[PDB]
């Protein structure tokens, strides 16, 4: 009874069959497969060496010789030439597997890009059919000038890093050296957002207050009140005097360390504000909200220059936003786990990055002008290169705990990461330098000092703490 | 299907194996055989409905059948069959050489036969003259 092995495709003298598949195998081959993988090679069911039935009928007889095979050395010649084809066939398979996986990635990319067109066109059609169904009778020049100034002044820093930069061997010895508590009421605990400017800092809380605090003077500098709901984000201006704050009551309010009153209120959002970002010159503030609009506004007068939906014709929660530090483009991250890059000059999408598997709670841009990082509830962190709009490297925690915050250092040598624990990556190596878990709850903000000489973090644990070596 | 039933001698469309069997049976054959006989057609083991498993082909990953006739296993096989033949040939040659070499070693009388001839002829040379 002629039989052939499902593993090798050759005849077999000893056919055998697994109890968990209909396929037939050569005994010594399937046993070695079971010995490595413990499973059926074709149905992938669990399989053991005793679950085999022996097809003990008469096996396949020898093939006839080729006429050249009638001599022992010509059999050795024939065996050598046979082996070279078998080797090259095996090499062709691993080449073909690389090509197939390469083409599948491109194919899925093109299909994904096509679904974006489908979604945009489907909404245009719905709005058109809705209209039928209810039918009744120098700013742009300044930015390039400023961005080219900003990106050109960077070039010396890109060629040489500061000589005062803290070493990796120093950052490996980071320890808790300051702790501050009681900044917000224990009845509605946790710092919801933080920003720093040297030893100066600004904090939000669930208690509706905004408090400006100096973690070197151990004292409150000023307190601001008037928000109807909890504070989600804050920004401390480079002038050390102006303070910016955003509330879940859909309004942004602006404050001064010198003043007991609201410097401005910016009625521009229809929904709770989730994240905000500061332009590199400090002249203007950018914001995002659950209403899916980004909006760009004057910090002082509250007038808005332009406003466009992150996903026109749809509502999607936007969870992170940040300017590229040259200030002409900014990245946005939303609950669809799409990251969209916008050009402020055209006020249009410059790039779009499908990436993470869950909502992008944080985005960071490097002051080298080309590394980008995005962080998500799925517990991965990924590095992006804007020079080709591509990924470089990925890092993750295997427990998939959400990451709430990210920050590059001011030189863009280090990346701080915050979730259920505190971590810092040296980005050029993409290696974890240290991990710290001293907070008893989720981390809510990461910031760096000058020359990476200090690290600042906040948490729902009612504490603000600083680490140094 | 290319499997031929060991009992009916015709090609299957429903191949079945059981743990006490070895030749292939058809499903539509063995179930009536269980009902009348209850007995394995070849091994005469007891048959039961939980023993039978049915074969299938064309699943994912299944290697393509090599039809080119040459293969590494078959060449190593026939090289092994050459070696078995040559050693059994060499053994019977070595056996024959041992037997022939043995008896010619025992047959080495030439020096002692010569001394007997010398002894005989020297007797003759006296017997030829005492008359």
């Amino acid at each position: 009874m002629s039989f052939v092995c499902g593993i090798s495709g050759e005849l077999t003298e000893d056919p055998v069959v697994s109890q968990v598949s209909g396929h037939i195998f050569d005994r010594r081959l399937i046993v070695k497969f079971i010995a490595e993988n413990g499973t059926d090679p074709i149905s992938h069911g669990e399989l053991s060496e005793d679950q085999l039935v022996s097809l003990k009928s008469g096996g396949t007889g020898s093939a006839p010789r080729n006429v050249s095979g009638t001599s022992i050395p010509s059999l050795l010649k024939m065996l050598q030439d046979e082996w070279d084809t078998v080797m090259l066939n095996s090499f062709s398979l691993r080449q073909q597997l690389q090509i197939a996986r390469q083409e599948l990635s491109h194919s899925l990319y093109q299909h994904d890009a096509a679904c974006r067109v489908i979604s945009r066109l489907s909404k245009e059609l719905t709005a058109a059919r809705e209209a039928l169904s209810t039918l009744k009778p120098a700013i742009l020049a300044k930015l390039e000038e400023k961005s080219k100034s900003l990106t050109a002044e960077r070039k010396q820093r890109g060629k040489n890093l500061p000589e005062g930069l803290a070493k990796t061997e120093e950052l490996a010895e980071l320890k808790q050296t300051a702790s501050h508590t009681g900044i917000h009421s224990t009845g509605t605990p946790g710092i919801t957002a933080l920003d720093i400017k040297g030893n100066l800092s600004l904090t939000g809380g669930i208690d509706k207050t905004v408090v400006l605090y100096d973690y070197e003077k151990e004292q409150v500098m000023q307190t601001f009140k008037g928000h109807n709901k909890k504070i989600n984000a804050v920004v401390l201006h480079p002038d050390n005097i102006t303070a910016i704050s955003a509330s879940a009551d859909s309004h942004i309010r602006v404050w001064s360390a010198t003043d007991s009153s609201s410097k401005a209120i910016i009625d521009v959002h229809q929904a709770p504000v989730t994240d905000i970002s500061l332009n590199a010159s400090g002249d203007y503030i950018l914001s995002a909200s659950d209403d899916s609009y980004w909006a760009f506004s004057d910090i002082r007068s509250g007038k808005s220059l332009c406003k466009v939906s992150v996903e026109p014709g749809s509502q999607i929660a936007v969870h992170s936003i940040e300017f590229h530090p040259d200030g002409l483009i900014f990245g946005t991250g939303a609950a669809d786990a799409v990251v969209k890059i916008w050009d402020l000059k055209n006020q249009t999408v410059a790039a779009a990055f499908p990436g993470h598997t869950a909502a992008v709670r944080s985005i960071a841009f490097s002051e080298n002008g080309y590394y980008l990082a995005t962080g998500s509830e799925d517990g991965e962190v990924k590095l992006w290169d804007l020079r080709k709009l591509k990924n470089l490297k990925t890092f993750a925690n295997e427990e998939k705990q959400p990451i709430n915050s990210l920050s590059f250092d001011m030189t863009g040598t280090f990346l701080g990461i915050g979730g259920q624990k505190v971590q810092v990556l040296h980005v050029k190596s993409w290696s974890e330098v240290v991990s710290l878990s001293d907070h008893s709850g989720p981390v809510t903000g990461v910031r760096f000092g000058e020359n990476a000489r200090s690290l600042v973090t906040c948490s729902l644990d009612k504490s603000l703490r600083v680490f140094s070596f | 299907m290319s499997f031929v039933c060991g009992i009916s001698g015709e090609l299957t469309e429903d191949p079945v194996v059981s743990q006490v069997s070895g030749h292939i049976f058809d499903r539509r054959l063995i179930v009536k055989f269980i009902a009348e006989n209850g007995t394995d057609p070849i091994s005469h083991g007891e048959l039961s409905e939980d023993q039978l498993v049915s074969l299938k082909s064309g699943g994912t990953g299944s290697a393509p059948r090599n039809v080119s006739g040459t293969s590494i296993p078959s060449l190593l096989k026939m090289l092994q069959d050459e070696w078995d033949t040559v050693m059994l040939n060499s053994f019977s040659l070595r056996q024959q050489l041992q037997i022939a070499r043995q008896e010619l070693s025992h047959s080495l009388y030439q020096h002692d036969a010569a001394c007997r001839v010398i002894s005989r002829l020297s007797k003759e040379l006296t017997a030829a003259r005492e008359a």
């Binding site: 007889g61 020898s62 006839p64 010789r65 | 026939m78 069959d81 078995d84």
Partner: peptide, 26 residues
């Protein structure tokens, strides 16, 4: 061991006897 497939040669010869000839056993 090599030309054992001659068993099928006599089966082909058998087929020429079973076709175009007498009854099989009963």
């Amino acid at each position: 061991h090599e030309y054992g497939n001659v068993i099928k040669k006599v089966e082909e010869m058998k087929v020429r006897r079973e076709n175009e000839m007498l009854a099989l056993p009963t």
